[PDB]
Design an enzyme around this catalytic site. Structure first.
Site, PDB file in Angstrom:
ATOM      1  N   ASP B  25      20.498  59.446  -5.666  1.00 31.91           N
ATOM      2  CA  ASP B  25      19.301  60.336  -5.314  1.00 31.91           C
ATOM      3  C   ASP B  25      17.478  59.333  -4.840  1.00 31.91           C
ATOM      4  OD1 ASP B  25      17.394  62.317  -4.006  1.00 31.91           O
ATOM      5  OD2 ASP B  25      17.764  63.308  -5.145  1.00 31.91           O
ATOM      6  N   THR B  26      17.953  58.857  -3.900  1.00 32.92           N
ATOM      7  CA  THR B  26      15.822  57.916  -3.499  1.00 32.92           C
ATOM      8  C   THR B  26      15.886  58.057  -2.853  1.00 32.92           C
ATOM      9  OG1 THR B  26      16.752  58.032  -1.230  1.00 32.92           O
ATOM     10  CG2 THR B  26      17.908  56.145  -2.301  1.00 32.92           C
ATOM     11  N   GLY B  27      15.304  60.211  -3.248  1.00 39.80           N
ATOM     12  CA  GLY B  27      14.385  61.491  -2.899  1.00 39.80           C
ATOM     13  C   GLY B  27      13.926  61.540  -3.915  1.00 39.80           C
TER      14      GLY B  27
HETATM   15  C1  LIG Z   1      17.908  67.599  -4.816  1.00 38.40           C
HETATM   16  C2  LIG Z   1      18.603  67.332  -4.467  1.00 38.40           C
HETATM   17  C3  LIG Z   1      20.612  67.791  -4.535  1.00 38.40           C
HETATM   18  C4  LIG Z   1      18.823  68.143  -2.534  1.00 38.40           C
HETATM   19  N1  LIG Z   1      17.488  67.708  -2.732  1.00 38.40           N
HETATM   20  C5  LIG Z   1      17.282  66.689  -2.046  1.00 38.40           C
HETATM   21  C6  LIG Z   1      16.081  65.603  -2.983  1.00 38.40           C
HETATM   22  O1  LIG Z   1      15.703  64.150  -2.298  1.00 38.40           O
HETATM   23  C7  LIG Z   1      14.507  65.890  -3.328  1.00 38.40           C
HETATM   24  C8  LIG Z   1      13.945  65.762  -2.378  1.00 38.40           C
HETATM   25  C9  LIG Z   1      12.206  66.089  -2.122  1.00 38.40           C
HETATM   26  C10 LIG Z   1      11.249  65.251  -2.659  1.00 38.40           C
HETATM   27  C11 LIG Z   1       9.650  65.915  -2.599  1.00 38.40           C
HETATM   28  C12 LIG Z   1       9.795  67.656  -3.182  1.00 38.40           C
HETATM   29  C13 LIG Z   1      11.018  68.385  -2.313  1.00 38.40           C
HETATM   30  C14 LIG Z   1      11.664  67.901  -2.499  1.00 38.40           C
HETATM   31  N2  LIG Z   1      14.030  65.415  -4.587  1.00 38.40           N
HETATM   32  C15 LIG Z   1      14.019  66.177  -5.724  1.00 38.40           C
HETATM   33  O2  LIG Z   1      14.040  67.487  -5.627  1.00 38.40           O
HETATM   34  O3  LIG Z   1      13.246  65.669  -6.339  1.00 38.40           O
HETATM   35  C16 LIG Z   1      12.858  66.332  -7.403  1.00 38.40           C
HETATM   36  C17 LIG Z   1      13.474  65.548  -8.535  1.00 38.40           C
HETATM   37  O4  LIG Z   1      12.710  64.141  -8.932  1.00 38.40           O
HETATM   38  C18 LIG Z   1      10.880  64.514  -8.097  1.00 38.40           C
HETATM   39  O5  LIG Z   1      11.095  63.448  -7.214  1.00 38.40           O
HETATM   40  C19 LIG Z   1      10.909  64.294  -6.050  1.00 38.40           C
HETATM   41  C20 LIG Z   1      10.596  65.652  -6.524  1.00 38.40           C
HETATM   42  C21 LIG Z   1      11.570  65.923  -7.847  1.00 38.40           C
HETATM   43  S1  LIG Z   1      16.228  68.723  -1.824  1.00 38.40           S
HETATM   44  O6  LIG Z   1      14.913  68.320  -1.061  1.00 38.40           O
HETATM   45  O7  LIG Z   1      16.534  70.237  -2.332  1.00 38.40           O
HETATM   46  C22 LIG Z   1      16.960  69.132  -0.006  1.00 38.40           C
HETATM   47  C23 LIG Z   1      18.569  70.114   0.221  1.00 38.40           C
HETATM   48  C24 LIG Z   1      18.758  70.425   1.345  1.00 38.40           C
HETATM   49  C25 LIG Z   1      18.620  69.569   2.269  1.00 38.40           C
HETATM   50  N3  LIG Z   1      19.399  69.188   3.578  1.00 38.40           N
HETATM   51  C26 LIG Z   1      17.869  68.707   2.313  1.00 38.40           C
HETATM   52  C27 LIG Z   1      17.081  68.697   1.206  1.00 38.40           C
END
Ligand SMILES: CC(C)CN(C[C@@H](O)[C@H](Cc1ccccc1)NC(=O)O[C@H]1CO[C@H]2OCC[C@H]21)S(=O)(=O)c1ccc(N)cc1
Ligand SMILES: [Cl-]
Ligand SMILES: [Cl-]
Ligand code: NA
Lengths: 99, 99
Positions: B25-27
């Site tokens: 998960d790059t996000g």
């Molecule tokens: C949790 C994943 C399985 C799903 N997510 C994408 C994920 O990349 C999110 C994307 C993301 C990023 C920032 C803020 C909210 C969401 N990242 C995230 O929650 O990362 C958390 C862990 O490391 C931290 O760095 C980022 C926040 C923390 S999500 O944002 O809930 C999501 C769900 C469904 C869709 N269509 C699009 C996005």
């Protein structure tokens, strides 16, 4: 490009005539953008992540320019804390993960 | 390997002698895994996603295999809906995004 992961993989997008920054997010199935207007029809959707769910508007057949590469697909619009480019559009620009 | 994004980029991880599936998960800044026991002390952390924030337990210097590559680093444990490998460990295995 080749984008390393030492920092968040942010890119410039163009959507609905507007330039925005968005996160290339391999963990997101769908693309989700902060509230903005988009033309045409939409339908409501709930999407879930850490934290739980948010309600979004689903717009289909939206063109987005991602780092200079055009893609068309579904864009979800709603109270996401960050603009996220999900797999649905990353496939269209040929993005892959390599190690 | 080269992983395309038409499907979720799921890989096998090994942690505590146990195999699990996790999403590259790059996000995600951080690696977050579902409830399990890990050794040592933990520290508090809040992480924020779509949905809002959650409390997690932060464990440092955990040995984890990711798609057959050894990493040793921070693992967050909490009520994430899926095991996620974030950038903190993807950099250790040499992952990049390419298009
Ligand atoms: C949790 C994943 C399985 C799903 N997510 C994408 C994920 O990349 C999110 C994307 C993301 C990023 C920032 C803020 C909210 C969401 N990242 C995230 O929650 O990362 C958390 C862990 O490391 C931290 O760095 C980022 C926040 C923390 S999500 O944002 O809930 C999501 C769900 C469904 C869709 N269509 C699009 C996005
Ligand atoms: Cl789509
Ligand atoms: Cl392909
Ligand atoms: Na449309």
């Amino acid at each position: 490009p080749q984008i390393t992961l030492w920092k968040r993989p942010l890119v410039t997008i163009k959507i609905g005539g507007q330039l925005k920054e968005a996160l290339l997010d391999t963990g997101a199935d769908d693309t989700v953008i902060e509230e903005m207007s988009l033309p045409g029809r939409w339908k409501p959707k709930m999407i879930g992540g850490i934290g739980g769910f948010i309600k979004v508007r689903q717009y289909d057949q939206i063109i987005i320019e991602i780092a200079g590469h055009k893609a068309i697909g579904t864009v979800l619009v709603g109270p996401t804390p960050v603009n996220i480019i999900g797999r649905n559009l990353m496939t269209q620009i040929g993005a892959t993960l390599n190690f």
